[PDB]
Amino acid sequence: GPGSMKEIILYTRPNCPYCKRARDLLDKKGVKYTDIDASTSLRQEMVQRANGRNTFPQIFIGDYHVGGCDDLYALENKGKLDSLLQDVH
């Protein structure tokens, strides 16, 4: 059958000295991450239709909302790498 690849979306402002880790890992693996401006005007609607209902900053991946930046790292190192990679893929 055909293939299947998910996409990663980060919801936050461009002034995130921590998010650099998340974006770094993604680009390092070789995936396409979408940077969503903190502006709720578009973030609220995006995150709302992305998960179903939400209006706060966090790290979205495929069909799941992580939350914190380091979170993705810890989980990925804990064994959730498969999911993260499968989502960012």
Side-chain angles (χ1 to χ4, degrees):
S4 284
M5 61 200 294
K6 270 80 268 271
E7 62 204 307
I8 193 272
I9 322 183
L10 38 135
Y11 294 93
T12 15
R13 47 162 185 180
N15 317 111
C16 47
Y18 51 91
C19 80
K20 274 163 161 86
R21 297 144 163 80
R23 70 185 289 287
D24 173 40
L25 194 146
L26 276 27
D27 168 47
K28 185 153 158 173
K29 293 302 216 211
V31 276
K32 262 278 147 254
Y33 70 85
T34 298
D35 60 286
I36 307 294
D37 286 311
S39 47
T40 57
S41 157
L42 296 176
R43 170 264 293 281
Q44 188 188 272
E45 58 184 42
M46 283 252 224
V47 72
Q48 270 167 339
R49 196 70 175 193
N51 91 85
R53 170 161 217 283
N54 191 18
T55 178
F56 280 89
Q58 41 57 233
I59 299 85
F60 223 115
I61 53 117
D63 284 304
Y64 168 77
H65 51 281
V66 178
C69 177
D70 304 71
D71 301 0
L72 79 89
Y73 243 78
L75 300 166
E76 175 182 324
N77 180 267
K78 258 63 197 302
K80 304 300 206 291
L81 161 135
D82 207 5
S83 181
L84 266 288
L85 251 91
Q86 275 174 225
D87 279 289
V88 302
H89 172 219

